[PDB]
Structure 1
Amino acid sequence: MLSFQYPDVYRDETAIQDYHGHKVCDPYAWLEDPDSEQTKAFVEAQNKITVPFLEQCPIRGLYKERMTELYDYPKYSCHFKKGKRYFYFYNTGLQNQRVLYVQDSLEGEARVFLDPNILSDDGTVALRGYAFSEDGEYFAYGLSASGSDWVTIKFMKVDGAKELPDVLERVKFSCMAWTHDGKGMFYNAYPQQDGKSDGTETSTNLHQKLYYHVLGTDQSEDILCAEFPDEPKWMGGAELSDDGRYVLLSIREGCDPVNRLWYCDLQQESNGITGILKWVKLIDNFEGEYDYVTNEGTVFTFKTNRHSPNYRLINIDFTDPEESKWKVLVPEHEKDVLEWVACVRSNFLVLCYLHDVKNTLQLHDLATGALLKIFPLEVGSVVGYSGQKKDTEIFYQFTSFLSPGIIYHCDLTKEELEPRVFREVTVKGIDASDYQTVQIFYPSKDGTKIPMFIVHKKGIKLDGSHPAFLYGYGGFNISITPNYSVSRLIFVRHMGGVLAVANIRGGGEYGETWHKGGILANKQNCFDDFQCAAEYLIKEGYTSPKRLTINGGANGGLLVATCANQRPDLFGCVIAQVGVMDMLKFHKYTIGHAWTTDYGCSDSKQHFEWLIKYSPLHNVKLPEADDIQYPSMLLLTADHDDRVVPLHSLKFIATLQYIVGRSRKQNNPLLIHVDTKAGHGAGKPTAKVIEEVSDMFAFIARCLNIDWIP
């Protein structure tokens, strides 16, 4: 079955580092330099064996064709109003990038406002972030090339969609917030660094600053408004209060849902914005999240997790700011996570809750917090919303496993608040009625009950005969909720597959306690939860080890790679996308320093001892038993993934191929594909998305020998 040879890869046996007395050899450390001839040759040789492997069987072509057909459906974002105009994003079906449209009224003819597709041949220039001026007459937008986190901000006058000369460089992980006087916009930039800043570099990102750009000037004239030179990892994002009176500064360090909150009454500036603002340090620690919802004069409504792991709404009066004085507007729910809150039509609050990994949406009174209206939803997720304080209507977008979903509209000026379907699209070829979604709760090793969604064709016999695709993430307070995936439904329909999503600890599904259950000393909980999910699917007859594929990306790539090391006997196939593989060195590169709040840092003896136990790069080991080998493994990364630098996957695949791949009993392939002009994934053009899923399921089909079902 394996008709290729793994490439020659030099081992630097002298590359030995001492971590608190524990010696670690890193023979592929040289793969950390993306620019070397050695690394470039390594990538070329690896792609040279992977691509022919993926493309040998006609299944790739059948899948690609079906994906191209089925993914070709109209894709809309919610309408949103800015000034006197409406905007929405729309893809006719197969455009590489969705297009931003404008209309002068809801019944008015729409026209193209911003079309990213004309910015490159291959759709690899993508919108990343945008902000309209308060009056809706000016527009700032970020552009990222080749999938990099790096942004260039450009500007337009909305009337006539006129290009303006303003260009902002060195923007990354940035806010965009216009002052309501329409003079300029806050944003973040990083200082100059040696070498490249295009997404191919690994340089750590420190000393992010907050600037104010006056429209009509050169970037070099921009005002420095906040900086933290004594705290190089701090990141301060600005937003304007709804009345335009205050700049709110949310300072973060790491990835925990916490922030400092400082404010600036702009009217108290001595002569407008001219330098470091007169910041008032309302919350000056990282003990809780304070997410601005709205204010009425000095009374500020925040979504918080302070003493409230499932989140709640509090009012803090800037004139009486001590914690003991804060008012609880909407108390914490016992179990349901308050995901997000928006203020609309002056005195309404839109609250979105997560109840057992499904969304609900409710309208509350701002003055009392009292529930006023429940917006009815089927089982699934709210993935889009519009309606700001001055707006008198909302739009919201619902999606689920089995249908692309619906945009709803609700006119909030009406006495009876009845939502109506505004836009709905169905995909011909995938009849939702043929499939079912079930939710179960399985006990993990320590007895903790974990949610899992299972999607499958109705009427299947649970005889262990079905191929299964089990997805997980498990970290960073991210909740993995139902979403429409054409690519996964093709696996079900055309490969006879069962889909599963395990809501393992580390995620946000049951609030901050769920998140804390899968981080730091307890990261092993994630891997245990995920392995127990696999065991559930097997025990209950959905699948069998040899027919089971697991998949995850980034922190999810770490998840599946670790599970391959820990329980190789459990899985037939592993697809790890853009994964964090070197847990000892992740903090050294680009923004990886931010992830130590979930993982710890190997600089600490205590943390090193957690990390060394599960680090994928450091736990590649031949299975003891003669009858057990590693699952088939495919690593996917890209050369501009500056979120998770590709060296992670490069070093990991060299290690897999050397330790496991050289062994006689290993007949399952261990492969990497490194894409070009792509990065971590956000903004990836449609054409590349299609290639990627075609690669993924062709890999599964070849390794598990699955026949296409027409």
Structure 2
Amino acid sequence: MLSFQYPDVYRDETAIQDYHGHKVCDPYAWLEDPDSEQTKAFVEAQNKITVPFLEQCPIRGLYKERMTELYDYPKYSCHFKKGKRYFYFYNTGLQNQRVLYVQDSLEGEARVFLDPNILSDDGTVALRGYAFSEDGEYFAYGLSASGSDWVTIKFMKVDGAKELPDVLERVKFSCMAWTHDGKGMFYNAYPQQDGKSDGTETSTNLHQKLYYHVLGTDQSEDILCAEFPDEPKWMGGAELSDDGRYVLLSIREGCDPVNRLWYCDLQQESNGITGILKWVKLIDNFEGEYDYVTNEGTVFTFKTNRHSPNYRLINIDFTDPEESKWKVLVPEHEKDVLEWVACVRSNFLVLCYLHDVKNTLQLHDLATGALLKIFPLEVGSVVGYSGQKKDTEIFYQFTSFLSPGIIYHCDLTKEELEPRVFREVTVKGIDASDYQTVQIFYPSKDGTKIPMFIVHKKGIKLDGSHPAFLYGYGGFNISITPNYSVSRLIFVRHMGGVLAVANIRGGGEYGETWHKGGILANKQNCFDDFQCAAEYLIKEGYTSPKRLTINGGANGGLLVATCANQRPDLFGCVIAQVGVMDMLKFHKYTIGHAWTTDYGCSDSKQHFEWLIKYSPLHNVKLPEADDIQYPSMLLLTADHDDRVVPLHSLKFIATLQYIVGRSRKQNNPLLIHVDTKAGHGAGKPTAKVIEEVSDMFAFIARCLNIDWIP
């Protein structure tokens, strides 16, 4: 029979709530309290059955060993210049956290500048955001403990890497920007709250404020520069214009790519920064995004999606601000998304486009917007870039499914520009030439063509005999572009698998129209798109239902969990990482209120009607057909995940085990693993990353009985 027994989990049958006339029972609502002895006992009981299941078969050890070996390669970030020095991140291979290095010259010897590894035994203290003073002589950096979004900002004098006394607490979702006079720095902080603020609490985050910290003073002396007491969800991030004249405030409410844009000419302040600034409300609504690129006097260049879903560049003159007067510097492309733009060497613009989910990099003239040079790239993604207005060179990093990456360098003072390979590392053991990456477009239920990348060993027969790993996200205007993953390549090489990534709606692959096609009333399009990706892989012979594994994280966790409820017959295995499972209550915790722009909010009758149909927690149901059971499922979360509070996964697994786990026909396991000293994922130490992928693939291996291929 089964190899283990599911834990006893109390059902509060009195937990009933009325949603617009619809009665909803939430028997596991008590799991919403992370501090109770009841919840702690539940987590321990679940981990007690999951760990032995994952470690029983020797395949986990074989995988972990191969991952440790293959992932052990030098990892560099591209160089960036600040003041008179160069900086770059580098991990010898298996250090828990990458280290920040500094060199006084491009050819000079480098030395350790900031090593987060020495801040904890297990590498659970990580760098989260940083900002150098304009002259590059001072450095502010954020540290997060145990994977929490909470940040503590510390300071250092660059020359001699001297630690300073300045410490800023209660920082979260904060920008960091120094005024060019070198006096201090703008940052965001939240008011004091009852209970903990370490990542284990579920408390909603409201009333974020903008402060200014004068270097050499106590945080209690900080100046409040902006606040929105009547709009608790507004978040204002500050940045200084390239010439240091203006503070630009980008105010956001929710997750859509839109923002208010206010500015303050610092020279117009009566006596420096002493209180709420004299904000000029240039764009005082949430109808479009205005991303600062650079300015020349009062003429500001912004990347925008205002009446341009694929994005474009516009110049707004603060002295003649009306929309009818704006100049369109670089018009919107009919299909290619303008992902980001930077200004370098005074009058050059670096534009990065996404063409059929692949990146292109171009250099344009700032005055006219004319194309000047195309920087050639293979099929993949640009994941790093450096080069600000005063710089005379650029560095950019390229990655793809089969290559770790290449860091390029280009001296922009040269007449005939030509980038050169600055750094390149290959992984011995993974001969990229034994594999191939293809891109196909499959029709979804409504006929819309969806892109999908498929990576596999060359020459395989499309006889449906291969295990497959299909990944998706689908939301928040996030484009899922090619990236290097040793863990996935081990699945291909050592488990004979096929990798697939479906660029479903909700994402940003085809601009804001793509995004809107997967949100609110149309969120079901994401699930349909993904299910259709699975059907394609099956019909085309890459895999079969019992050999197919789907995976996603956060909004992607919601994706795969919903797909399991809707089409349990289509998948053999489902791994949902830190997923949003309770779609009726997500807005109640931490930063969840910001996601209503993609999902809607249950308080609304209309939204509730969309949400109730797909919410994973509210759609667990035994398959009607006797020959159909739920696929094997593994939920992965961590106790400091304050982005997507773990109660989502706790309640979902309790429900899966009770409604489906108790059925005689259910033989596939439904498990959860809650990690400690970890959170949503950012900053997770290498050691934990390796344990995680080892758990994932051991689960797939055991559930589908896959033999290891040495």
Q: Distance in 2 between matches of 1:344 and 1:409?
A: 13
Q: Distance in 1 between matches of 2:389 and 2:603?
A: 46
Q: Which residue of 2 aligns with 1:151?
A: 151
Task: Give SS of 1:660's match.
Answer: helix
Alpha-carbon deviations, 1:131-185, whole Å to 9, x = none? 0000000000000000000000000000000000000000000010000000000
Task: Give SS of 1:653's match.
Answer: helix
Deviation of 1:81 (Å): 0.2
Alpha-carbon deviations, 1:302-358, whole Å to 9, x = none? 000000000000000000000000000000000000000000000000000000000
Q: Spell out the pairing of 1:262-273 with structure 2 (5 A cutoff).
A: 262-273=262-273
Q: Spell out the pairing of 1:335-346 with structure 2 (5 A cutoff).
A: 335-346=335-346
Deviation of 1:649 (Å): 0.0
Q: Spell out the pairing of 1:151-190 with structure 2 (5 A cutoff).
A: 151-190=151-190
Deviation of 1:670 (Å): 0.1
Q: Distance in 1 between matches of 2:703 and 2:565?
A: 18
Alpha-carbon deviations, 1:157-215, whole Å to 9, x = none? 00000000000000000010000000000000000000000000000000000000000
Q: Which residue of 1 aligns with 2:287?
A: 287
Alpha-carbon deviations, 1:660-707, whole Å to 9, x = none? 000000000000000000000000000000000000000000000000
| TM value normalised by structure 1 | 1.00
Q: Distance in 2 between matches of 1:479 and 1:464?
A: 29
Task: Give SS of 1:293's match.
Answer: strand
Deviation of 1:93 (Å): 0.3
Moved over 4 A (4+): none
Q: Distance in 1 between matches of 2:487 and 2:684?
A: 15
Task: Give SS of 2:634's match.
Answer: strand
Q: Distance in 2 between matches of 1:394 and 1:683?
A: 26
Q: Distance in 2 between matches of 1:211 and 1:306?
A: 29
Q: Distance in 2 between matches of 1:600 and 1:209?
A: 25
Q: Distance in 1 between matches of 2:467 and 2:193?
A: 48
Alpha-carbon deviations, 1:588-637, whole Å to 9, x = none? 00000000000000000000000000000000000000000000000000
Q: Distance in 1 between matches of 2:135 and 2:671?
A: 52
Q: Which residue of 1 aligns with 2:698?
A: 698
Alpha-carbon deviations, 1:540-578, whole Å to 9, x = none? 000000000000000000000000000000000000000
Q: Distance in 1 between matches of 2:416 and 2:24?
A: 67
Q: Which residue of 1 aligns with 2:549?
A: 549
Task: Give SS of 2:437's match.
Answer: strand
Q: Distance in 2 between matches of 1:613 and 1:669?
A: 25
Q: Distance in 1 between matches of 2:35 and 2:337?
A: 45
Q: Distance in 1 between matches of 2:338 and 2:189?
A: 32
Q: Distance in 2 between matches of 1:701 and 1:506?
A: 31
Q: Which residue of 1 aligns with 2:348?
A: 348
Q: Distance in 1 between matches of 2:276 and 2:413?
A: 42
Q: Distance in 2 between matches of 1:623 and 1:348?
A: 59
Q: Which residue of 2 aligns with 1:668?
A: 668
Q: Distance in 2 between matches of 1:345 and 1:376?
A: 20
Q: Spell out the pairing of 1:176-215 with structure 2 (5 A cutoff).
A: 176-215=176-215
Q: Distance in 2 between matches of 1:59 and 1:421?
A: 39
Q: Distance in 1 between matches of 2:490 and 2:252?
A: 40
Deviation of 1:539 (Å): 0.2
Alpha-carbon deviations, 1:403-452, whole Å to 9, x = none? 10100000000001100000000000000000000000000000000000
Task: Give SS of 1:656's match.
Answer: helix
Task: Give SS of 2:302's match.
Answer: strand
Q: Distance in 2 between matches of 1:416 and 1:680?
A: 45
Deviation of 1:258 (Å): 0.0
Q: Distance in 1 between matches of 2:384 and 2:175?
A: 19
Alpha-carbon deviations, 1:464-484, whole Å to 9, x = none? 000000000000000000000
Task: Give SS of 1:144's match.
Answer: strand
Task: Give SS of 2:367's match.
Answer: coil
Q: Distance in 2 between matches of 1:592 and 1:485?
A: 29
Q: Distance in 2 between matches of 1:133 and 1:603?
A: 45
Alpha-carbon deviations, 1:52-82, whole Å to 9, x = none? 0000000000000000000000000010000
Q: Distance in 1 between matches of 2:2 and 2:127?
A: 41
Q: Which residue of 2 aligns with 1:2?
A: 2
Task: Give SS of 2:661's match.
Answer: coil
Q: Which residue of 2 aligns with 1:229?
A: 229
Task: Give SS of 2:521's match.
Answer: helix
Q: Gaps (5+ residues) in structure 1?
A: none
Q: Distance in 2 between matches of 1:704 and 1:495?
A: 11
Task: Give SS of 2:433's match.
Answer: helix
Deviation of 1:261 (Å): 0.1
| Alignment root-mean-square deviation, CA | 0.3
Q: Distance in 2 between matches of 1:419 and 1:492?
A: 33
Q: Which residue of 2 aligns with 1:498?
A: 498
Alpha-carbon deviations, 1:359-400, whole Å to 9, x = none? 000000000000000000000000000000000000000000
Deviation of 1:524 (Å): 0.1
Q: Distance in 2 between matches of 1:177 and 1:673?
A: 39
Alpha-carbon deviations, 1:65-115, whole Å to 9, x = none? 000000000000010000000000000000000000000000000000000
Q: Distance in 2 between matches of 1:14 and 1:469?
A: 41
Q: Distance in 1 between matches of 2:271 and 2:696?
A: 58
Q: Spell out the pairing of 1:400-479 with structure 2 (5 A cutoff).
A: 400-479=400-479
Task: Give SS of 1:620's match.
Answer: coil
Q: Distance in 1 between matches of 2:367 and 2:51?
A: 60
Q: Distance in 2 between matches of 1:693 and 1:257?
A: 32
Q: Distance in 1 between matches of 2:559 and 2:275?
A: 45
Q: Identity across aligned pairs (percent)?
A: 100
Q: Which residue of 1 aligns with 2:484?
A: 484
Task: Give SS of 2:421's match.
Answer: strand
Q: Distance in 2 between matches of 1:359 and 1:57?
A: 41
Q: Distance in 2 between matches of 1:277 and 1:625?
A: 65
Q: Distance in 2 between matches of 1:59 and 1:417?
A: 50
Task: Give SS of 2:50's match.
Answer: helix
Alpha-carbon deviations, 1:508-534, whole Å to 9, x = none? 000000000000000000000000000
Q: Spell out the pairing of 1:607-646 with structure 2 (5 A cutoff).
A: 607-646=607-646
Deviation of 1:231 (Å): 0.1
Alpha-carbon deviations, 1:252-272, whole Å to 9, x = none? 000000000000000000000
Deviation of 1:229 (Å): 0.3
Q: Distance in 2 between matches of 1:291 and 1:322?
A: 18
Task: Give SS of 1:195's match.
Answer: coil
Q: Which residue of 1 aligns with 2:530?
A: 530
Alpha-carbon deviations, 1:14-56, whole Å to 9, x = none? 0000000000000000000000000000000000000000000
Q: Distance in 2 between matches of 1:496 and 1:175?
A: 44
Q: Distance in 2 between matches of 1:318 and 1:118?
A: 48
Deviation of 1:2 (Å): 2.7
Q: Distance in 2 between matches of 1:583 and 1:98?
A: 36
Task: Give SS of 2:687's match.
Answer: helix
Q: Which residue of 1 aligns with 2:55?
A: 55
Task: Give SS of 2:350's match.
Answer: strand
Aligned residue pairs, count: 710
Q: Gaps (5+ residues) in structure 2?
A: none
Q: Distance in 1 between matches of 2:450 and 2:652?
A: 29
Deviation of 1:216 (Å): 0.2
Q: Distance in 2 between matches of 1:292 and 1:77?
A: 24
Q: Distance in 1 between matches of 2:91 and 2:311?
A: 35
Q: Distance in 1 between matches of 2:389 and 2:2?
A: 61
Deviation of 1:246 (Å): 0.1
Q: Distance in 2 between matches of 1:167 and 1:100?
A: 20
Q: Distance in 1 between matches of 2:627 and 2:496?
A: 27
Q: Which residue of 1 aligns with 2:95?
A: 95
